Amino acid sequence: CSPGIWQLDCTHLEGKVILVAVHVASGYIEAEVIPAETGQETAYFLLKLAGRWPVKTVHTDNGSNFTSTTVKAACWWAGIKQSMNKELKKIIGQVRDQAEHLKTAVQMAVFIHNHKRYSAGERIVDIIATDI
Amino acid sequence: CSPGIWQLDCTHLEGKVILVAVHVASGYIEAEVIPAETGQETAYFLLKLAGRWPVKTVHTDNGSNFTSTTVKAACWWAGIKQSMNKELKKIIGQVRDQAEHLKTAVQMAVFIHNHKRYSAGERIVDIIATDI
Numbered sequence: 208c209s210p211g212i213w214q215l216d217c218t219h220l221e222g223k224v225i226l227v228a229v230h231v232a233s234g235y236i237e238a239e240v241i242p243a244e245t246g247q248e249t250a251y252f253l254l255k256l257a258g259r260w261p262v263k264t265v266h267t268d269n270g271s272n273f274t275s276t277t278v279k280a281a282c283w284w285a286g287i288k289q290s291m292n293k294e295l296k297k298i299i300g301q302v303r304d305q306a307e308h309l310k311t312a313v314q315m316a317v318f319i320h321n322h323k324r325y326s327a328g329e330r331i332v333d334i335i336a337t338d339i
Numbered sequence: 340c341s342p343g344i345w346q347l348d349c350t351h352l353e354g355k356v357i358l359v360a361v362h363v364a365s366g367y368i369e370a371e372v373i374p375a376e377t378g379q380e381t382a383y384f385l386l387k388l389a390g391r392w393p394v395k396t397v398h399t400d401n402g403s404n405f406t407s408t409t410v411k412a413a414c415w416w417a418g419i420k421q422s423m424n425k426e427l428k429k430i431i432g433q434v435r436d437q438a439e440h441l442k443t444a445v446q447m448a449v450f451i452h453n454h455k456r457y458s459a460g461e462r463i464v465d466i467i468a469t470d471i
């Protein structure tokens with residue numbers, strides 16, 4: 208798929224919100240725990256993702272998340288335009304005993320996902336690099 | 340330089356702590372605002388960085404930051420072993436008026452730094468990909 212398409216969704220676990228970004232063409236994931244499922248957390252997350260990877264278009268399974276003027280401004284500033292969450296939840300449960308806070312287990316699961324085999328982290332760098 | 344060497348340092352601005360990670364061979368930066376300059380924030384940051392990029396060795400200008408058992412455990416789990424901050428502070432001041440919170444301005448400055456020209460974000464993907 209195109210090298211700039213990211214899918215972004217907000218999932219739940221242990222009463223907390225986990226925002227999951229997936230590089231469609233590669234399966235590479237960037238996920239974080241946020242205190243609330245607000246537009247301010249989404250906007251701030253998009254600004255982080257955009258500055259680290261080429262984010263050209265963003266898709267979601269809940270269009271209402273991209274309706275806040277806060278989120279639209281972030282998409283405007285970064286020049287952004289408009290399944291996997293169970294695989295991650297699977298990994299989180301496997302490593303959940305190794306961590307106290309859920310945020311730590313989430314990052315443990317992101318590490319495992321991106322580096323497990325080529326791997327998702329290896330495909331994205333090859334895709335983004337090929338396009339360059 | 341080697342494709343897995345990252346430099347990590349904790350800088351200050353507006354009474355808050357900004358942790359800055361720099362991919363030595365490329366100049367690519369990942370930076371975030373943390374509430375306090377504690378080992379728990381460092382460890383959690385390392386776990387995030389490691390899961391998104393190949394982090395093999397980490398250097399710092401303050402060795403005492405890597406002495407906490409909390410940080411050493413993160414380095415252990417992720418298989419990690421053991422100038423730029425002014426360029427970023429320069430960009431943060433330029434865009435500071437465009438944001439209320441310092442964390443937003445930091446990510447704005449990371450975006451600008453990595454994508455400004457090849458750019459730092461383009462060199463890192465070419466370096467990591469070449470090594471693959």
Ligand SMILES: Cc1nc2c(c(C)c(C)n2Cc2cnn(C)c2)c(-c2ccc(Cl)cc2)c1[C@H](OC(C)(C)C)C(=O)O
Nearest residue numbers: 305306307308309311379380382383408409412413416
């Ligand atoms: C909350 C926490 N405290 C920790 C550690 C460690 C290793 C120590 C010694 N302590 C103090 C302690 C624990 N028990 N006692 C009696 C004292 C870790 C940790 C877990 C896995 C990895 Cl790879 C790396 C660090 C965490 C993790 O949180 C972060 C935010 C990452 C620090 C978490 O969520 O478990």
Ligand SMILES: Cc1nc2c(c(C)c(C)n2Cc2cnn(C)c2)c(-c2ccc(Cl)cc2)c1[C@H](OC(C)(C)C)C(=O)O
Nearest residue numbers: 247248250251276277280281284437438439440441443
């Ligand atoms: C705190 C904040 N509130 C915001 C916005 C926006 C665009 C609106 C409308 N509001 C509500 C508002 C502001 N004034 N009034 C009277 C009502 C942004 C922002 C700034 C730059 C970008 Cl590219 C994208 C969003 C932020 C930033 O914080 C994050 C954590 C990113 C949300 C920040 O630090 O400025």
